Design an enzyme around this catalytic site. Structure first.
Site, PDB file in Angstrom:
ATOM      1  N   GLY B  76       0.770  -1.222   0.000  1.00  0.00           N
ATOM      2  CA  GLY B  76       0.000   0.000   0.000  1.00  0.00           C
ATOM      3  C   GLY B  76       0.805   1.279   0.000  1.00  0.00           C
ATOM      4  CG  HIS B  77       4.331   1.795   1.688  1.00  0.00           C
ATOM      5  ND1 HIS B  77       4.512   2.828   2.582  1.00  0.00           N
ATOM      6  CD2 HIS B  77       4.208   0.675   2.430  1.00  0.00           C
ATOM      7  CE1 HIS B  77       4.498   2.353   3.811  1.00  0.00           C
ATOM      8  NE2 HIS B  77       4.315   1.047   3.752  1.00  0.00           N
ATOM      9  NE  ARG B  78       0.295   3.614  -6.661  1.00  0.00           N
ATOM     10  CZ  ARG B  78      -0.911   3.342  -7.132  1.00  0.00           C
ATOM     11  NH1 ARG B  78      -1.710   2.511  -6.474  1.00  0.00           N
ATOM     12  NH2 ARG B  78      -1.322   3.907  -8.258  1.00  0.00           N
ATOM     13  CB  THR B  84       5.792   6.781   0.932  1.00  0.00           C
ATOM     14  OG1 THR B  84       6.459   7.325   2.083  1.00  0.00           O
ATOM     15  CG2 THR B  84       6.436   7.292  -0.343  1.00  0.00           C
TER      16      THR B  84
END
Lengths: 208, 208, 208
Positions: B76-78, B84
């Site tokens: 779930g880290h973009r 982030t």
């Protein structure tokens, strides 16, 4: 195991305990795979002395399992001396009594806001990771990292920056990580895009 | 310690347990120095969901202690978003309710047949190590590895291939790792040499 | 935890136990962060066999937590053979009975005098680290290191030497690490400087 699931971490604020560790809001650590609470991530940090270097972590940081921040400067090891042996600290041996203290501080270790640290990433003494920086897993950080830089490797080296230089400059100016929560929730829809310029406007506007 | 001696490992088939881990025959893992059974080598792998990425290991793999396969894609880290921080996952905070799910799968992690993995080697999400490949210890694999490639380093980079390109091509064609056991025992004398061409003939012959 | 504090290590001589580990005087190890005594740092070392390779550590070595010395040569894995699978060792399987022993020693692992080893540094089989050498943390040593060389990285590579070539040459000649204690205490004031030339004189003099 201080953690219940590999998919559930805990707040730094709800587990830090060494007084020489200053964590920010919302920053969290998930160490189910290393089982220890965040305090043991700070290696060789004295909870006793106010004289030592301190580990400081910004707000909104996501910290991977088993990360480690090596502290205590040189630990009394002087590579430029004829011997890297910490004689001064080897008490018992009376022969080593005259030894001078080769110890040297290195400066607080500073981790900026929104730093995403990979599992098992290791930081050497005195480094300063900038806001937004992304530390790859297993990355051995031996020096300062710039805001929004993506690093990784042993030794860790910048691979590229997350946004443009301008983009970055804007991000650094509005510093959303310091925004009152109401505004963070407000701008939420935009914090989930890469539209820095849009965000910047939404900011400039609200400011009025 | 799930293991009795540093010199005695156990079959993947006799210790794997997460349903999203598909190990092949004869492949084994020896983790006396990390004490946990192979299931905990798959980091962040949900045994619950059929929707997630899976770790697949070919046959005849020898896996070193403490190896680790990082899963769950980005978690779930973009990095291309302005933050982030996995807001979407931070439930409690009602302010973070509108957050969109930045999570993204990365694809099954595939380890080919006869992959020799060094102790503490770490594989990033979605990599595909090819048959015969040799992963050095402490090697941080961040991308696909070719059949019979010898890699190592952080980041891991090919050092050379085990055999000639032709040799390789032949090996890939006869695929001994899929051979009925009787034939594996048969060709045993040749599997203990570097005479790929010889092996290839012994193969072509038996085939008739 | 075999250790009481992150800031208190124990002598190799007061904790080594495998007979195939020969540690020198004053050399110490501090593994509070890995909790195991020095014996488990030697991976795959048989305390039984006199036939195996041995780990030898010079005098005055300061060894960081979780360091590891991979032993047992190839562990029966021949990369130049058609298969890197240790068939010979897979007893149970009767089919693998004819397998030849692909095992190969690699030579004793030698760590010189006054080697400063970083936490979690890992040494591959058969390397020889020279006196004074400094091994960085997380450094993966895959080959011989020269006296007074400062290495680090995966793979580990020399970053520079601690002293001049001449300086080094002198240090190597007086070998203070072999000095009777009385002389070590005597020259103590000079062992806490970088004045190799001075030390060298103080030596030449006392010798008379």
């Amino acid at each position: 195991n201080y953690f219940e699931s590999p998919f559930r971490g805990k707040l730094l604020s709800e587990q830090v305990s060494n007084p020489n560790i200053r964590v920010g809001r919302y920053s969290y650590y998930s160490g189910y795979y290393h089982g220890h609470s965040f305090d043991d991530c700070a290696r060789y940090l004295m909870p006793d002395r106010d004289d030592v270097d301190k580990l400081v972590i910004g707000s909104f940081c996501s910290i991977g399992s088993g990360a480690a921040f090596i502290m205590a400067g040189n630990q009394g090891h002087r590579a430029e001396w004829a011997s890297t042996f910490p004689f001064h600290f080897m008490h018992e041996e009376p022969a080593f009594a005259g030894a001078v203290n080769g110890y040297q501080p290195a400066g607080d270790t500073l981790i900026g806001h929104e730093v995403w640290i990979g599992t098992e990433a290791m930081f050497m003494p005195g480094v300063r990771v900038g806001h937004g920086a992304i530390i790859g897993s297993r990355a051995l950080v031996t020096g300062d990292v710039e805001p929004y830089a993506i690093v990784g490797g042993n030794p860790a080296r910048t691979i590229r920056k997350r946004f443009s230089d301008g983009d970055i400059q804007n991000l650094l100016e509005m510093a959303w990580w310091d925004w009152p929560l109401a505004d963070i929730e407000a701008a939420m829809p935009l914090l989930c895009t890469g539209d820095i310029p849009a965000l910047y406007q939404h900011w400039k506007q609200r400011q009025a």
